[PDB]
Amino acid sequence: NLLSDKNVAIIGGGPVGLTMAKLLQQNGIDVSVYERDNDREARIFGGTLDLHKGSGQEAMKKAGLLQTYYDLALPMGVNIADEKGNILSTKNVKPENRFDNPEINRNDLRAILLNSLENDTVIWDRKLVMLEPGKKKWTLTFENKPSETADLVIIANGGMSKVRKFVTDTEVEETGTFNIQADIHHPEVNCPGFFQLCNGNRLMAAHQGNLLFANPNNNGALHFGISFKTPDEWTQVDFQNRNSVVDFLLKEFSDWDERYKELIRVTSSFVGLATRIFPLGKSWKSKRPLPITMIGDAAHLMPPFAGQGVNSGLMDALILSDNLTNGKFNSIEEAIENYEQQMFIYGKEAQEESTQNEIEMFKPDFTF
Numbered sequence: 001n002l003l004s005d006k007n008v009a010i011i012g013g014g015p016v017g018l019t020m021a022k023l024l025q026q027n028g029i030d031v032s033v034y035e036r037d038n039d040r041e042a043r044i045f046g047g048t049l050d051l052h053k054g055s056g057q058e059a060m061k062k063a064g065l066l067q068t069y070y071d072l073a074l075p076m077g078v079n080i081a082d083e084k085g086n087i088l089s090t091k092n093v094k095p096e097n098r099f100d101n102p103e104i105n106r107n108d109l110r111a112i113l114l115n116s117l118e119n120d121t122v123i124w125d126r127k128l129v130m131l132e133p134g135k136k137k138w139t140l141t142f143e144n145k146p147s148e149t150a151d152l153v154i155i156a157n158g159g160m161s162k163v164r165k166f167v168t169d170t171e172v173e174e175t176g177t178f179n180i181q182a183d184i185h186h187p188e189v190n191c192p193g194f195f196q197l198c199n200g201n202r203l204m205a206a207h208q209g210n211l212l213f214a215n216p217n218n219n220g221a222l223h224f225g226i227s228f229k230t231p232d233e234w235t236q237v238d239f240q241n242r243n244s245v246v247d248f249l250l251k252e253f254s255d256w257d258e259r260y261k262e263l264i265r266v267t268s269s270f271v272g273l274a275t276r277i278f279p280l281g282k283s284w285k286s287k288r289p290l291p292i293t294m295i296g297d298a299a300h301l302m303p304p305f306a307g308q309g310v311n312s313g314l315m316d317a318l319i320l321s322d323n324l325t326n327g328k329f330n331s332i333e334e335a336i337e338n339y340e341q342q343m344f345i346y347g348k349e350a351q352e353e354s355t356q357n358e359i360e361m362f363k364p365d366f367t368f
Ligand SMILES: Cc1cc2c(cc1C)N(C[C@H](O)[C@H](O)[C@H](O)COP(=O)(O)OP(=O)(O)OC[C@H]1O[C@@H](n3cnc4c(N)ncnc43)[C@H](O)[C@@H]1O)c1[nH]c(=O)[nH]c(=O)c1N2
Pocket: 011, 012, 013, 014, 015, 016, 017, 034, 035, 036, 037, 047, 048, 049, 050, 126, 127, 128, 129, 156, 157, 158, 159, 161, 179, 181, 225, 273, 295, 296, 297, 298, 304, 307, 308, 309, 310, 311, 313
């Protein structure tokens, strides 16, 4: 009843926005996703995602996609190593826990979600640049493309979103840590020592404030990340110049075993990213001119040290879609308010845990 003869615009087709769209569409809602990516073949850079029972997996189950996820996800164990390459502990996944949070490639998750939507639900090459509330509909302005209208706008376009001001004046913050990520293709050949160290498990190591994480099998590539407190001199490293990054990393990792150094020396290109947070604090704006809200990283971007990132976003989509379709609310505004009040609770909890882990993980003495 709330959305009958109305349409919904979701801004951003990340995992959270696409899940949003599926959950609305399967209830007969007219919904479009506007995604800035030029088309669906653009690869998504990054590590794997794990969906949790009761949150991310509950969104997939409601959508009819839980088995689809299971079929493309891998449970993976964890090895903790020290800087010398000694395995300090090894924890494999017991078979009764194979469904707790198996890891899925981000492109596979995207494909699962896109395949679940009706044709032309996602409108590619649509970068939203501005919103304007009319008498009853939002007008959406896109970069060099014709405008569109919607009764309800859901901001789902990630942590650096510039279209949040109708919802909140909160600004994204840097937390003081920095991340460098890279993929190694054919790792069994190109970083064989480190690949054997992982031994089919994820690997984590920490030494003198420098952290290293690796997944040796993300659809055949090894993905790794290195994190550290942002240096005071900084960004004096040009991530377009691999020689500049290799030089910086080899100094920081000078005391690490050569299996780690070879990882750095053979990487083709590096991606640098300051850690950021979009902090939940005082309430969002009340009495907005037309119905609008935010989900996912746009709502509560958070340091990736607690593993709660995408799962809290998928809970947003589950809660918001239920409120918009369960027939219990007298207005779209009230369904939104109910979602936001719930999400401020679990969102603040996740953000606190992420921020606490971050403080603790970068203390000079930290051990996993
Ligand atoms: C290094 C690192 C490591 C991890 C993680 C992050 C980082 C940086 N995370 C966090 C997790 O990946 C994150 O929570 C999700 O990607 C959030 O998904 P969203 O769909 O909200 O945003 P996401 O950023 O994925 O999607 C936003 C979409 O909007 C599009 N877009 C942006 N601006 C637009 C515009 N103006 N108009 C239209 N479209 C626009 C983008 O192209 C993109 O498709 C994580 N999480 C987790 O659960 N487990 C983990 O292990 C990790 N690990």
